[PDB]
Amino acid sequence: MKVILLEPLENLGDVGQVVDVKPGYARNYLLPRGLAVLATESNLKALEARIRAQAKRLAERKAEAERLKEILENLTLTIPVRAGETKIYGSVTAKDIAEALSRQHGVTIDPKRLALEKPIKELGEYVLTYKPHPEVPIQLKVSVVA
């Protein structure tokens, strides 16, 4: 009695691998409680259609990111701060770095989730990382002209 599940069930497991069980369980507890369907050839085909429908986008969400994450480690954005010496009068945060990338090369960001705790003062040299799941490091120089 092969049924395709919906959620975990602890030995008779999780979100949709298939497994068969005693037929009484199925037609009185598993399908009536709306947490499985038997593996009709159509439903057996519909799942496999939606296994790749996700796993291609999963293979794509992890292709959308590492396409940008690959054309990002080739640039370098400058930050020409009114900065005096070795210390910024203002500061640079993510939102401002977004502004930098948005028009020094024309790219947008979250800007959140950028390894920026306590936005960076203090002219110098910095290399920060980014997201999604596999992620990208980015370098950027903070400089000073009027």
Binding site: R27, L31, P32, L38, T40, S42
Partner: protein, 96 residues
Amino acid sequence: MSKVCEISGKRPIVANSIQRRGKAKREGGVGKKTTGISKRRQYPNLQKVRVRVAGQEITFRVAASHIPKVYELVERAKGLKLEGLSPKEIKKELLK
């Protein structure tokens, strides 16, 4: 209907109860005899299958042999209208 399967059309048949005294001739058995032969009905193993289809519950009297046929008919779902006499549709018009 009357002790019949709604899905298989299987209905009670007539068989004979045959009482036999004797050893099987295939056992050094001078012969099997027959003491009585009378009429008996064999009844299909009928059971209630109670399924909640779109609106209300739907109750079948199916031969236990054809029980999954109900749940494969439960698959077909469209026309979420009137009373518990949807089987009119779930029936032969599915299979026809």
